[PDB]
């Protein structure tokens, strides 16, 4: 059956639906956080996209889009703030799509600044893998730490952070 | 025809079959080795996965999935084992699917602590990749260097593997 | 309508063609370039690929292929040849495809030499994510940073970039 078949390759298609999506962030010194800007794009794969800084979980349900990304503040990632070394990109998604979707990877890009010089520096990140059910927020815990302090010295804090997301899941 | 147009897009969908898939594992103190246990799951992409461990080639014929992975102590990594800095992590699968898949990438990530905290030292890995026909058994080599000696105190020794499995091929 | 069905199945898996290309390249010590060899080759997913020194964009478009990736000796990147730790691999790449294509990620991988060693130093790459239209040149501004000087003893300046290549674009 040619129906079938065709309900098998949309399932199929889905299951295929893969994005690294980039967030450029500012490790903001002496706070140990990476923070993001509210901002507002489309994925050929994931649809509609918006970053909301300080929402509710409440409030991120009432955005018109696919998928809602608000950071947060929580500590989720023990650090000692003057140091500079180690900054948390913690965030949470309001998933507002038929399906369960999978946030696994991140990675911590130093931008090349108008120098054409980039933190070149141990980089390490770390994060907890989150599936998100469909209308369910989920948090998604990260980090990176560095192997020099950070400085806004020559765009030395800024960065794309690329977070690997998947329909597929496990 | 669209009888040969749906022909192509289950080739073309099937192309697209992408997976990083996320094998929990301990490097070993004093073993130079990352250690997988026996596992079995469920990929939306790939099907059944099957960790297990101290398996023959034939053996893992035998097991009742899509892939079988068995890690190889074979040594295939120069390292020395009292200091700690490289682990390996080479593995064989048995692909038991209809299409040669292909192993083209390795991530070492840091697992995060009840703590919240997660070993930040430079952290390399370097792999072979390797495309295993149908039926075929095929051996990937990776291993990571770290820039501190890995201890288990605190969690020291966990991670979470990230290997790229797909069935494009070049 | 089957038809239109059809079609949208034909764009969305268009959109999910996702490739990381891997790419040997050999870090020329004194050079400040990461240096590739002539090829060509096929992806299932991206066809037909070749890689051409010395094109200027003008010859690039008179090759027979779905891509073809030049290398250049552009500088795009600041550095102190002599000190060889950071190298750059900065390509461009004509779009002889239907449609856009991005490049959005790169990740440098040591090669393992017949002694099973690899240079396991901090290891730190960054890039300039770039779309490219049909038919179109777009540049890759790309490049690594180690912690340690890079040497071809032992096969250390051996590499294997992997750049990430989507048709999925935001």
């Given at each position: 059956t040619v129906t079938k078949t065709i309900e098998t390759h949309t399932d199929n298609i889905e299951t295929n639906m893969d994005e690294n999506l980039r967030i450029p962030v500012t490790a903001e010194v002496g706070s140990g956080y990476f923070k993001m800007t509210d901002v507002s794009f489309?994925?050929?794969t994931l649809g509609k996209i918006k970053i909301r800084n300080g929402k509710s979980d409440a409030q991120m349900k009432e955005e018109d889009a696919d998928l809602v990304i608000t950071p947060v503040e929580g500590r989720a990632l023990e650090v000692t703030v003057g140091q500079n070394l180690t900054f948390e990109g913690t965030f949470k998604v309001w998933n507002n799509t038929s399906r369960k979707i999978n946030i696994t990877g991140m990675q911590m890009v130093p931008k090349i600044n108008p120098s054409k010089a980039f933190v070149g520096s141990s980089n390490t990140?770390?994060?907890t893998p989150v599936s998100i059910?469909?209308?369910e927020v989920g948090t998604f815990v990260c980090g990176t730490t560095f192997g020099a302090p950070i400085a806004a010295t020559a765009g030395g804090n800024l960065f794309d952070m690329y977070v690997?997301?998947?329909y597929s899941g496990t």
């Open positions: 489309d994925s050929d990140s770390s994060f059910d469909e209308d690997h997301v998947t």
